Amino acid sequence: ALLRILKETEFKKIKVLGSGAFGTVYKGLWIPEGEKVKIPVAIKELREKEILDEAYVMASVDNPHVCRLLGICLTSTVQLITQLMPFGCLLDYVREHKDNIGSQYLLNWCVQIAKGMNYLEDRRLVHRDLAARNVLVKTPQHVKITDFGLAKVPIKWMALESILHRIYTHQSDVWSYGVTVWELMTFGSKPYDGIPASEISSILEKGERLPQPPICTIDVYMIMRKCWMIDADSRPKFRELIIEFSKMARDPQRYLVIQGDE
Numbered sequence: 001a002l003l004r005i006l007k008e009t010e011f012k013k014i015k016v017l018g019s020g021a022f023g024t025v026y027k028g029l030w031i032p033e034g035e036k037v038k039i040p041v042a043i044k045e046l047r048e049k050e051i052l053d054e055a056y057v058m059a060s061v062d063n064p065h066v067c068r069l070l071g072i073c074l075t076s077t078v079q080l081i082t083q084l085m086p087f088g089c090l091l092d093y094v095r096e097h098k099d100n101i102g103s104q105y106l107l108n109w110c111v112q113i114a115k116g117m118n119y120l121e122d123r124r125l126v127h128r129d130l131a132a133r134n135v136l137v138k139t140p141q142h143v144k145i146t147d148f149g150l151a152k153v154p155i156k157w158m159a160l161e162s163i164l165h166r167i168y169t170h171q172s173d174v175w176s177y178g179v180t181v182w183e184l185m186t187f188g189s190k191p192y193d194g195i196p197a198s199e200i201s202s203i204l205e206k207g208e209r210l211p212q213p214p215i216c217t218i219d220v221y222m223i224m225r226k227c228w229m230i231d232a233d234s235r236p237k238f239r240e241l242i243i244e245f246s247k248m249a250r251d252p253q254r255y256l257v258i259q260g261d262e
Ligand SMILES: *CCC(=O)Nc1cc(Nc2nccc(-c3cn(C)c4ccccc34)n2)c(OC)cc1N(C)CCN(C)C
Pocket: 016, 017, 018, 019, 025, 027, 042, 082, 083, 084, 085, 086, 087, 088, 089, 090, 091, 092, 132, 133, 134, 136, 146, 147
């Protein structure tokens, strides 16, 4: 019902925003026939009615912090159309604006991402790929999780049970959220940098986690370490994360120590 079936005519690709294994994501423009408007969109052209039932689930996602699937073009390839996020991804945003981001901005992004995920959990959906590269910036104070439904490997964002047993729950998403928060607090550092992906399980089983980012007080880093608990049920719930980070965002200077914030 809310899945607009497009014809090649109403949309045209411009630049390539990203690519690899699943297909290419392009910057584009959507000028539907019946209308007289040009809407900037992002087009994920996948490789060759197989995944059309997943697209109807993606089209039904109705939350301000989750990207909704606008339309689809079913030809020899599947082409997925969505609103273009003009500021790009949050990972590139925190790297580019590294020296101008205050504690209120980071804590609010934490609330927004937790909210979008808690919406997916309420809808009985699992993301399977939450990362700062997959959080997009609509405006600097409005972020949305993208790539929902593309999952049907990002080892350094995977929970232990996902690497070992291929288990994907809402609790494995919480682990990936903990890593996404680490990416925001370190201004886009790569998790377990240098460290090969084949030994991440060894490191996790050993007891090793991502280090405390300098700007985090103990209170913020404790939320992150709870997301990375071996026991999935001991991790915080997405609705507790909204509560923890919303309270922190009320007095942001107590929880994050930013040079050039107060
Ligand atoms: C983290 C890289 C990234 O996403 N960068 C960009 C994103 C833009 N917008 C946008 N809007 C909606 C959806 C997507 C999107 C979705 N998926 C799964 C993507 C994968 C790769 C790339 C984009 C994806 N993207 C955007 O629009 C203005 C620009 C960028 N980048 C590519 C700008 C240049 N960058 C190298 C700094």
